[PDB]
């Protein structure tokens, strides 16, 4: 695409500059260009890809929630008819959001996942695939909603199976995956008990493994454990 003429290393360098400038749309475009060079990504490069798109889609999701709330209020009894504008604009933001999700899913399918053989890369990409199907599920209201939900579930499940066999229970990718799959269960799959069980079990197994860690790894793992605890406190 438009990044085909720029060196891979320059795209990476510019992605890091865009991050410092909080220019996440640019950061994502640079990282897409880097992926499209066709080489596998290092750990740092995978993190840059993930940060960039999570920030872009995070802004779109927050805007979609604002607009969806306004639209829902407009459809309550006693609300004045204001025309098609709220629906139209929510749909515009929704279509943009879906486009970003499709872009990320396309990078994962062509060809990040198939080339990823180490547990740390494969689990990371499968988690991403689950996340972007989950974001599609957040806005899905039609006949493919069940299939979108099952695509998220299937990607998360494969990531969980690999992470349990190949990673320690304190590994940050394993922990972040479990956090997100637990959110999937709670608010996408209508399975709050599964969400709570997964969070509590993940937390307890990580706690039992902290003794093996250096001080820096302990800080990394406990940070994510606190997110699991935050959700357990909210949900129980």
């Amino acid at each position: 695409g438009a990044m085909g003429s720029m060196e891979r290393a320059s795209l990476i360098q510019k992605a890091k500059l865009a991050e410092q400038a909080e220019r996440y749309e640019d950061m994502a475009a640079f990282m897409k260009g880097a992926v499209e060079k066709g080489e596998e990504l290092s750990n740092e490069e995978r993190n840059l890809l993930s940060v960039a798109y999570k920030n872009v889609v995070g802004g779109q999701r927050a805007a979609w929630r604002v607009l969806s709330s306004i639209e829902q209020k407009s459809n309550e009894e006693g609300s004045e008819e204001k025309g098609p504008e709220v629906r139209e604009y929510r749909e515009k933001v929704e279509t943009e959001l879906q486009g970003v999700c499709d872009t990320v899913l396309g990078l994962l399918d062509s060809h990040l996942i198939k080339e990823a053989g180490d547990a740390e890369s494969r689990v990371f990409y499968l988690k991403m695939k689950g996340d972007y199907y989950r974001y599609l599920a957040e806005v899905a209201t039609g006949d493919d909603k069940k299939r979108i939900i099952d695509s998220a579930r299937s990607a998360y499940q494969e990531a969980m199976d690999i992470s349990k066999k190949e990673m320690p229970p304190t590994n940050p990718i394993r922990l972040g995956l479990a956090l997100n799959f637990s959110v999937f269960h709670y608010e996408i799959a209508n399975s709050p008990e599964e969400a709570i069980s997964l969070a509590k079990t993940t937390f307890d197994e990580a706690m039992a493994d902290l003794h093996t860690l250096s001080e820096d790894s302990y800080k990394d793992s406990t940070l994510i454990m606190q997110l699991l605890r935050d959700n357990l406190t909210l949900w129980t």
Partner: peptide, 8 residues
Amino acid sequence: RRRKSCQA
């Protein structure tokens, strides 16, 4: 209080 997902 919005639930946490894996975000910085």
